[PDB]
Amino acid sequence: AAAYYVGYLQPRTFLLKYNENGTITDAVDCALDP
Amino acid sequence: FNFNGLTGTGVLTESNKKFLPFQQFGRDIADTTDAVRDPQTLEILDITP
Ligand SMILES: *[C@@H]1O[C@H](CO)[C@@H](O)[C@H](O)[C@H]1NC(C)=O
Ligand SMILES: *[C@@H]1O[C@H](CO)[C@@H](O)[C@H](O)[C@H]1NC(C)=O
């Protein structure tokens, strides 16, 4: 009585955002759109 | 100072940053070390030129 999901990883460039506490709260995937 | 093999010069001050258990150092935008955790008392200090 459950479900699970499966995705595959690829090499990419991400722009991550750290906050005042050091937690990652946002990210941007550069190779998605212009 | 020589913290766990990392040598340098500066002034050490008490800090208010909260590292996660698996972290030992912290860096600025210039990519230089700014905060350290004491390997004995486990307090966190700020390094200033
Ligand atoms: C994050 O840091 C701020 C001050 O820089 C603090 O007020 C806030 O409570 C912190 N977030 C926590 C502890 O979850
Ligand atoms: C090293 O000794 C100090 C007391 O001088 C102690 O507080 C500390 O827990 C010891 N080392 C570690 C890794 O805790």
From Swiss-Prot, chain A:
Record: glycosylation sites: N21
Source superkingdom: Viruses
Spans annotated as Putative superantigen: 19-34
Cited function: Attaches the virion to the cell membrane by interacting with host receptor, initiating the infection. The major receptor is host ACE2. When S2/S2' has been cleaved, binding to the receptor triggers direct fusion at the cell membrane. When S2/S2' has not been cleaved, binding to the receptor results in internalization of the virus by endocytosis using host TFRC and GRM2 and leading to fusion of the virion membrane with the host endosomal membrane. Alternatively, may use NRP1/NRP2 and integrin as entry receptors.
Subunit structure: Binds to host ACE2. RBD also interacts with the N-linked glycan on 'Asn-90' of ACE2. Cleavage of S generates a polybasic C-terminal sequence on S1 that binds to host Neuropilin-1 (NRP1) and Neuropilin-2 (NRP2) receptors. Interacts with host integrin alpha-5/beta-1 (ITGA5:ITGB1) and with ACE2 in complex with integrin alpha-5/beta-1 (ITGA5:ITGB1). May interact via cytoplasmic c-terminus with M protein. May interact (via N-terminus) with host bilirubin and biliverdin, thereby preventing antibody binding to the SARS-CoV-2 spike NTD via an allosteric mechanism.
Entry protein name: Spike protein S1
Species in which this protein is naturally found: Severe acute respiratory syndrome coronavirus 2
Residues of the full protein shown: 262 to 295 of 1273
From Swiss-Prot, chain B:
Organism: Severe acute respiratory syndrome coronavirus 2 (2019-nCoV)
Consequence of changing T7K: In strain: Omicron/BA.1
UniProt protein name: Spike protein S1
Subunit structure: Binds to host ACE2. RBD also interacts with the N-linked glycan on 'Asn-90' of ACE2. Cleavage of S generates a polybasic C-terminal sequence on S1 that binds to host Neuropilin-1 (NRP1) and Neuropilin-2 (NRP2) receptors. Interacts with host integrin alpha-5/beta-1 (ITGA5:ITGB1) and with ACE2 in complex with integrin alpha-5/beta-1 (ITGA5:ITGB1). May interact via cytoplasmic c-terminus with M protein. May interact (via N-terminus) with host bilirubin and biliverdin, thereby preventing antibody binding to the SARS-CoV-2 spike NTD via an allosteric mechanism.
Residue span relative to the full protein: 541 to 589 of 1273
Domain of life according to the entry: Viruses
Known role: Attaches the virion to the cell membrane by interacting with host receptor, initiating the infection. The major receptor is host ACE2. When S2/S2' has been cleaved, binding to the receptor triggers direct fusion at the cell membrane. When S2/S2' has not been cleaved, binding to the receptor results in internalization of the virus by endocytosis using host TFRC and GRM2 and leading to fusion of the virion membrane with the host endosomal membrane. Alternatively, may use NRP1/NRP2 and integrin as entry receptors.
